[model samples]
Target: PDREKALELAVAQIEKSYGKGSVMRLGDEARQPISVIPTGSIALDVALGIGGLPRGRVIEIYGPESSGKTTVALHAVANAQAAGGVAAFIDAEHALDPDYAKKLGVDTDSLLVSQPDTGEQALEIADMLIRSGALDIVVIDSVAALVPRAELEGEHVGLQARLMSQALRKMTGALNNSGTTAIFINQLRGGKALKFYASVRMDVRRVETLKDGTNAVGNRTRVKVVKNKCSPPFKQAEFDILYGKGISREGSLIDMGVDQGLIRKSGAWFTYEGEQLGQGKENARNFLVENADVADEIEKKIKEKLGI
Candidate 1:
């Protein structure tokens, strides 16, 4: 009788847990908003074992100034928006040119660009936006804004760079938990040491190359992911911008290269021992006083130099 009694209780527990038999959370009507997957460009998606951005995860696209970080972020936003979903840009730099964005197919009207000044402000606005649940895809565009990180290289080890990386990870957790898929575009620079590719980690990088060795202006650009959340950094994933389709990886795909602005020639590939490298997280209350500064500088310089 005692054994039978225990068995009965077990059955009851299973029914409660499964809802139908036992797991209720597993039962129907437990239905929640399913996460929507974001597709990488067709070529790169094939390389991703999952074939696209996971429904609920933070994908950090770190790289130095103008390293195709925004390019990819914009691509993700437009891609999601293309699928009838809304996308948001944190606009830490406010460098998201509406004209450029429109050409990329990201409905500027659909994208709410938060113009945060200081790094701390960037964090506050970003957090609020993520919490609001108004955006289908939210892009912080940068973590350093909230956290003070060197644009070029890390001052120290796990103390400065790595811990900061973790803090960014935590921030993403908040957004991810809320089912917001986010992208962070980081900047990059040459390490103090030429062989320090493994130390200064950037997500994706942009490269300017000669097109048929002709004209002062090249036909297009090159791109690569120097570091990523997954094991073994992706190899030589090169792509370029198109008139209508933002960035399509159709050209020669190769591995990390300083020349390519992704990693060093040493080939450490920024994934040493399967650990994430770069920056400490001392800035939690970060605000973006302004967006991509260098990008701003470039514009300023262009207008002054070209008299445009």
Candidate 2:
């Protein structure tokens, strides 16, 4: 009885020195659940297991050129806005097309877009936006393009890497309990610091070219979660990135449903929820696009099965 009282007093002293909830008994204290923002792709979300990107974490999306890195970032921005959250974009490359973003469903008018002249400026802007706690998501486009001013003027070997390492260290601390998600879009280049700091790292690649009568319309892209701290890593998802239409949401959903056996394919017809929607995969996609209620039901069923 004396030992138990002493232990309680020790815990109280620790709490007083630090703060409430600083010390907790294992399993006795329930951890706070993480919140997520859907990436707008059913396959990707299902693979992520948490339904989307977790808030208060860093996400790295890197790949080859035209591999849909920017497309995915824009899609997430649009989803964040759809969920009634504010978002910012640090376009370090200065190549963000407002019209293209608009086509991707992003509300450009409400988005805080900044084109920083140097890597330091870009990181500073991102830090400010994240620490402010007023934004839900902040995207930094192309880590390779975040060039330090000195490097741009003269040859400063290893300068960018060092700067990134420092910035990420500071940002990671600021992200704790801030309820903000930071996305770093990078190319197929050096990113040791980013890979180390990011909670989730995705590798995107273009697998097949989508064409329409000798004209390239888009590409069938594959997104592989290389490192994920929140769930099982290395899970992959494939979806089409239409040149002007952004991510094919209905198409991805139909494909996911078919893959999970939630939607049945019989001969030349497709069936879902005891209803014959249409024939062929394209037809099914069209049906989902036309009928939003049915699509929602199908998505709900899919999430239920996945335990999301």
Candidate 3:
């Protein structure tokens, strides 16, 4: 057969087996949406610029359970619901906490959560959710769980097992075409210490009481943005997790300082601008502590944002 005839036959065979979009010419997919929604969190939202996390790409958040991985996921669901969008979370290991859901402000009616154990089960759930198109953001909480962990660090698992993982990854790609943001929450095996090339490792810190002489020292929950695919690579930030004093920009204590443009506390906080301190024995506040000067260096800003 001539080259043209052979080429035509090959094309027919490929199409018959693979179907449309199984292959594409260059630049045609350049404009395709990468993800469906912003990541659904504000600190993450700001660091990633106003666009937030892209829709189609895979974003990873890795931390041990209760380290606020669920907290972050719940926040995303709540944010999406606030924006009048629907979201789904596939709880691979059945570890979701509905209480955490409520605390994070996720609208139970607007969110879809599933608990799956095996990779096959997770895939089945994801396919149904994405094909339904009722969701703006979807999460496969912990891709590593679905993936085979037994041979994760070994090279003996050969191409076929590896291909299975690839097939699983392709499911997220399917959601992308429909403009759904796919995120994965990962559980770290070792310490909060991150590995190389990890997408994001959020070191959720809590206040460790440090007694310096007679004064009781209060610290901030230090956020270690170890790996970030959606924000500045390898950069770090610390946000108070205590709402008003945390990383949140809304009505919270840290933003209180960010708003007043002051450095230290002297009066009943500042009751001006869009900011207002809670009325109490001490001004209702939670301040983000920083190890460095990225904090507002104003005497009070530094003291409130990072009391050191």
Candidate 4:
């Protein structure tokens, strides 16, 4: 009887905060919405694992110059907005191009962008946004450009490290309680070396250089999950951030489908259900458009691979 009474009391408290039926012996819905933010891109979502970035955590994306770090953050930002949530971008490096971000699918009117003078300022402002209970996501452009409050005035060695550690400790706690996902971009030092404070850490490196015969085109970069506390790490995939366009998901859908075994790739052609589909990505896309039955099969295969 005493155990029964205790259970009732516990349920009452949970219902008070999360409404009725918020607790169960083996609860599923209790933790669903508060768990992951599904990034809009499918293959990239699979590469990150769990179909998206975990909510209420700091996920870092670091890479060399022009390796598509910011592009990933913006993708996540778009996902947040699509879910009817607010988003913020802390552009510490002062390199944010509104035109480019808009091209990347960011809802400029629904999103907020800020440029703080120092790292401390940026994190502090970010913390405020996380705790405000209004936003579902926050992104910091690049950690490499953040300078501590007084550190630039003569703050000595390890200043950035200390600041990073302190800010992350506080921000992590706030994010956890608030259910806001934080996307942080950091620049690689030498080869590597960013602290382990982030719940998920990713490294982006350019693999394919895209260019026309003369001028220049964009490049493809590989995003690798280095540290993921919420799930297994080391999952990697490649995507391109086109020059005029940005983070082109259409370019890699069929390619990733073939690579992931969701679709059969034979030389230059692709097939589904043992039927010849198309010879190339564009062809495969057209095939899907022309055949609803084939499209449904292909869509199912792609969603299965994406864990959707």
**Candidate 2 Cα lDDT to native:** 0.85
- Cα-based RMSD of the predictions, in order? 18.6, 6.1, 12.3, 7.3
lDDT of 1 at 113: 77
Q: How close is candidate 3 to the true structure, as a TM-score?
A: 0.59
Candidate with best TM-score: 2
Task: Predict model 4's lDDT versus the native.
Answer: 0.74
Best prediction by lDDT: 2
Candidate 4 local lDDT, 1-308, one digit each (tens): 98999988988898689643344442122222334776545666666656678888778888888888877787788778877889998987778777877776778877887889888889899999888989899988777777777866764566777777778889988998989888878775501334455767888888988766687678877888877655556678777667867765555566666776877878888877788778866578567657767666655678665455
The sequence of per-residue lDDT tens digits that candidate 1 reaches over residues 1-308 is 99989977886788666432122221122222233343334334323323345445566666567556676677678778888777777765656677877776679986777766545456556667777766667777555544434422444333334434444545565666766676655555412211121211234554664343354322244434343332223433455544444563322112211223332223422321233222221110011112234323323332243222
TM-score of each: 0.53, 0.87, 0.59, 0.78
Arrange candidates by TM-score, descending. Answer: 2, 4, 3, 1
Clashing pairs in 4: 119-147
Count clashing residue pairs in model 4. 1
